[PDB]
Nucleic acid binder design. Structure first.
Ligand SMILES: O=C(c1ccc(-n2nnc3cccnc32)cc1)N(c1ncccc1Cl)[C@@H]1CCCNC1
Ligand SMILES: [Mg+2]
Ligand SMILES: [Mg+2]
Ligand SMILES: [Mg+2]
Ligand SMILES: [Mg+2]
Ligand SMILES: [Mg+2]
Ligand SMILES: [Mg+2]
Ligand SMILES: [Mg+2]
Ligand SMILES: [Mg+2]
Ligand SMILES: [Mg+2]
Ligand SMILES: [Mg+2]
Ligand SMILES: [Mg+2]
Ligand SMILES: [Mg+2]
Ligand SMILES: [Mg+2]
Ligand SMILES: [Mg+2]
Ligand SMILES: [Mg+2]
Ligand SMILES: [Mg+2]
Ligand SMILES: [Mg+2]
Ligand SMILES: [Mg+2]
Ligand SMILES: [Mg+2]
Ligand SMILES: [Mg+2]
Ligand SMILES: [Mg+2]
Ligand SMILES: [Mg+2]
Ligand SMILES: [Mg+2]
Ligand SMILES: [Mg+2]
Ligand SMILES: [Mg+2]
Ligand SMILES: [Mg+2]
Ligand SMILES: [Mg+2]
Ligand SMILES: [Mg+2]
Ligand SMILES: [Mg+2]
Ligand SMILES: [Mg+2]
Ligand SMILES: [Mg+2]
Ligand SMILES: [Mg+2]
Ligand SMILES: [Mg+2]
Ligand SMILES: [Mg+2]
Ligand SMILES: [Mg+2]
Ligand SMILES: [Mg+2]
Ligand SMILES: [Mg+2]
Ligand SMILES: [Mg+2]
Ligand SMILES: [Mg+2]
Ligand SMILES: [Mg+2]
Ligand SMILES: [Mg+2]
Ligand SMILES: [Mg+2]
Ligand SMILES: [Mg+2]
Ligand SMILES: [Mg+2]
Ligand SMILES: [Mg+2]
Length: 62
RNA sequence: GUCAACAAGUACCGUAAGGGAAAGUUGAAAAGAACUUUGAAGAGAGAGUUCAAGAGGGCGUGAAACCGUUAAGAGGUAAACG
RNA sequence: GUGGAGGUCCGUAGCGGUCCUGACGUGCAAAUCGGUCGUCCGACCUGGGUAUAGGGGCGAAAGACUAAUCGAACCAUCUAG
RNA sequence: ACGAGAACUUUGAAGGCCGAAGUGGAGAAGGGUUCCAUGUGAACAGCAGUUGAACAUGGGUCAGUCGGUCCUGAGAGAUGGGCGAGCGCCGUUCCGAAGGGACGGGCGAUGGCCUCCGUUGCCCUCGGCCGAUCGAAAGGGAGUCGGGUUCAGAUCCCCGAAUCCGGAGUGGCGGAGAUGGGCGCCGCGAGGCGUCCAGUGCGGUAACGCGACCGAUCCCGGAGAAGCCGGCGGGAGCCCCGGGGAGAGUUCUCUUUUCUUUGUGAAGGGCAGGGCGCCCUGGAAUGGGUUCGCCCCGAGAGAGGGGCCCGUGCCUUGGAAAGCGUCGCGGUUCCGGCGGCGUCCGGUGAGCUCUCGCUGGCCCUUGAAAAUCCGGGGGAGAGGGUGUAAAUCUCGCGCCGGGCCGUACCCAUAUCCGCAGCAGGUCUCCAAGGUGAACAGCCUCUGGCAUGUUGGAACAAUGUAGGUAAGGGAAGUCGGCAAGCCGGAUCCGUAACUUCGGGAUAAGGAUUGGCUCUAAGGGCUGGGUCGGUCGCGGCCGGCGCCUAGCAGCCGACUUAGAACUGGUGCGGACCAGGGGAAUCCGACUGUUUAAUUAAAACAAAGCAUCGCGAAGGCCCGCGGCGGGUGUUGACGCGAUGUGAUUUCUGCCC
RNA sequence: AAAUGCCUCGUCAUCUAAUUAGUGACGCGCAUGAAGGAUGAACGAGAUUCCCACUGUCCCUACCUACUAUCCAGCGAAACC
RNA sequence: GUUGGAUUGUUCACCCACUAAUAGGGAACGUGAGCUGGGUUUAGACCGUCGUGAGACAGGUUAGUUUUACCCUACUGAUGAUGUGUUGUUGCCAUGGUAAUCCUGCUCAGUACGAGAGGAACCGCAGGUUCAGACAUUUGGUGUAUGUGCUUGGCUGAGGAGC
RNA sequence: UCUGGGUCGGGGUUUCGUACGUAGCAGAGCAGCUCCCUCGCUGCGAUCUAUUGAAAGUCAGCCCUCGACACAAGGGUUUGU
């Protein structure tokens, strides 16, 4: 019943956290997660012919 | 007296080289205390063996230091002594 | 932004041993214990197997260590020096 | 309860501690019977014991597959040789006539199912594991798993599934090799009979596949056989989250509740999944593909299509007959009894621990060897004359064997060492829930234990360990010694100085609870317009514009903001830097007197000098032209001083 | 006037109410000095001086807790003489 | 009675401040099984001077284990012992110990005294210092009454009640 | 003994700060029910308010009880002019 209340947001707080925000969730993992989301929507638009091979490749570097 | 009169180069010690003790005696004969009784037993009390258990299984004799007990005497200049 | 280097830093287990000149000091112990401390990817820590033996060994060097023994180990003898 | 006797034994109940880096479960060393029963109750276990690791009496360790055994490593070590008065010791390929083998060739005596054909003697050919031998219970090293079982043993016994190696003269059976063509009569023909010629397998463009699929001396190769660290990814085990059961717990009220439990070995066969600098088609600039990071491409990208490897996961055989959970019924009541029922369906992840893989980083550091095994190249040779044939077979099945030694238990606040049941020391494997960054500390579950060699009663001094303290705030003291303060995290803000890296968590400040909300951050599905119209579903196409994306379902965790709210409390315990200004010294990290000195000492990088071109330099050695450096060669070895950088290093021979 | 300066508590400045301390200067320096001299970040369980915060370190002691001592049952040493 | 401090290991010294005063000594240079370990101060190390050197320095610097009482006595407390028949109650005092101390203010008096500047004292009163003996109404400390609230992490299915 | 002193209980004192339940048209808000409602009525919800200076403790070394309940002439060892 505390995991039920933590997932609603309670007890999380700024005085209930004791490790650094990078230790609490690594920003490499945030970057690694975000890159995979934005790279597979680009591969999915290319094979669905929304974007061509040229708009894909310039977007892929942004 | 050989370290060793005895289950002695033994037990034990040290990684090893090596080091290295202690310990003899019931009685003539086991006759090594049957039996009864108290105790859970060890231990006792009787009884018995023997010349002897003031010889009872590390037991011949059994000193002293030291200790217990009884008896007698004494005790404020620590005892002791001439 | 990503990336993740370093005899890098705080800090575990380990390894070590600073201070209290704390406890102990006929001890739990012929060197221990408590707290605080040093280091903690490196000249790191460790098991087993090997090599080096006494005026010799081995030493990031204190004359340190070489079986509780070290400015020359231990054992027996010369020796009742 | 037993007992003469209970603070200490055992059983139950409670209350607690270790708290998965255990006070848990197993081992290596080392011990040596301590293991396990029963009995005792003297001694010993520093109180006591009805207890014991004591005493007595018995019992207990089962192997082709687990180790040893085998292999080589650092190294040890004989022989030849050399030295040595000598016991010997030097040396390990060096001052050696160091192969004792081999299919075959051939001469053979011939013993023989003497047709022969296994043996054998010499000859011919062939030939460097060029160093005997030893060295690992953590290296290398074929092949065993599940279930049951004892007072004490089990991967060893039993039951059941396997499996490697070795062998089989009298070959044990299949299959492969290997049974085709041409011609000529005959057969209406399907097929016979004759004759001639083949036949040491076949498929795929390819990578490669197929059950076998000749072949020696020799030769080339592979496996064995390789560091550390980082980052991802796959798979498992555990954890977790929804449900479905079976059984317990609570039930004063609430709780569709809380807990426990909810299997499939090896070896086969298949299929997911993972990897591939593997193949083929084709030819890329408006460069494209792509990872967290990279990286890749005319020496062939993207895209299509294949191939191989791994497959520890899932399915199947094993296999439910076993096990487990419940519920019952019996006796031989000390039976691997008997029966029912079940052993289900999902979801998550920067989780943890193993493992597999990919790809990087670092190195004046490049991270064993060998037994063993395999593949290829080569072709000496061998096989039979068209037969239900031969040599041969790394294919399937069958048959026989696997000896010797270890195997109990302890593995440590009581089995080991420390004179002892000694707070010391002593190498590893597994590792749950909560909090949290965390194998931190704290609390709990599994498992374990009885407070560490005595109890009782008191609450004096002095201690030892821990706390607090008005008002001052180092005045104490040789010295702020000791203690205290500080502390996490978020948001701000950070000087001098500097080798530009640092200083730095500088310093300094704010914030932190609970509750109720709010935003933001993803994943899987379906965008199909008219039946044009019959094999309530499709068969080929008129018939249409999601195209600024909708719609359904599902899913974690985290960040920011706001309202309310409390006696201003909020990192509430635990965890958890006091800071500043200077001077001296050593650059730093590292090291050091085990048991009074951790430092400014030693080390060190950098700098500088010296010797030496091998009959050499330095050094060992009783001795040998014996050793070490040296598997070396001046960018090297050897001998010294100083001690990073910066800046300098004067004069005297 | 340095970890090197006898004289020496050197002289002047600063720091304090007060400084044989510390820092900055000065220097015929008892007896500084160049592979060692002079520096300089970072680092240090190294030595030293002051400031801020903090405090029983003190003025000046007090009180509370655990284990002792203390008493009892059991057990029972040694140094020394 | 003879103090609180800076520097120094200091004894001494010197200075600041207070005070009625900040006198001098002794007791195994009183006192370490009382402490501390700052000076000296074994083994480490650095510098200067000396020495060919190992080393030395009555020179500077830094680091460096402080053991035992349970015996007899003394001392401090605690029982007790000998007498008087036993036993109790109420008392006496031999002897030994002995403790209080100093200063301000007011007043005297701005008087005596003195040219002036300055400037007392006794009586009296009001307080304080140092010491001594107590005590806890009060204020302060303590606080495990484990009193009563609050609160973190965990645990009993939650609530409640608790650990 | 005009008993007695104990153990509970009661009262006084005092310490802390308002218990549990229940109720509330108190509550930041959120979720629901719509024949309802004519702006409802069920939930969730820290906190608040009333019941409530409540609740809990209070001699063990606090005070006073005369309520309840028991128990108390019982033992053991010595002492003579
Ligand atoms: O334990 C002792 C200890 C003390 C005294 C003796 N003595 N002295 N005289 C003695 C006469 C007879 C017997 N013993 C005797 C023995 C040893 N320590 C110790 N203390 C100081 C110097 C040396 C040592 Cl070793 C240790 C060190 C570690 C920390 N704890 C203390
Ligand atoms: Mg006689
Ligand atoms: Mg006689
Ligand atoms: Mg005789
Ligand atoms: Mg005799
Ligand atoms: Mg005679
Ligand atoms: Mg006799
Ligand atoms: Mg007498
Ligand atoms: Mg000490
Ligand atoms: Mg002591
Ligand atoms: Mg102990
Ligand atoms: Mg020396
Ligand atoms: Mg000598
Ligand atoms: Mg003589
Ligand atoms: Mg604990
Ligand atoms: Mg075990
Ligand atoms: Mg164990
Ligand atoms: Mg005993
Ligand atoms: Mg046993
Ligand atoms: Mg061998
Ligand atoms: Mg075993
Ligand atoms: Mg023990
Ligand atoms: Mg205890
Ligand atoms: Mg106990
Ligand atoms: Mg205070
Ligand atoms: Mg001072
Ligand atoms: Mg002072
Ligand atoms: Mg300190
Ligand atoms: Mg700084
Ligand atoms: Mg250093
Ligand atoms: Mg030492
Ligand atoms: Mg030390
Ligand atoms: Mg030189
Ligand atoms: Mg000359
Ligand atoms: Mg200077
Ligand atoms: Mg000072
Ligand atoms: Mg100066
Ligand atoms: Mg000179
Ligand atoms: Mg020069
Ligand atoms: Mg003395
Ligand atoms: Mg002393
Ligand atoms: Mg000293
Ligand atoms: Mg010295
Ligand atoms: Mg010099
Ligand atoms: Mg000289
Ligand atoms: Mg509650």
């Amino acid at each position: 019943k505390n995991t039920l209340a933590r997932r609603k947001g309670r007890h999380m707080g700024i005085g209930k956290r004791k490790g650094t925000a990078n230790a609490r969730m690594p920003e490499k993992v945030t970057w690694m997660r975000r890159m995979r989301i934005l790279r597979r929507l680009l591969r999915r638009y290319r094979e669905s012919k929304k974007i061509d091979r040229h708009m894909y490749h310039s977007l892929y570097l942004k």
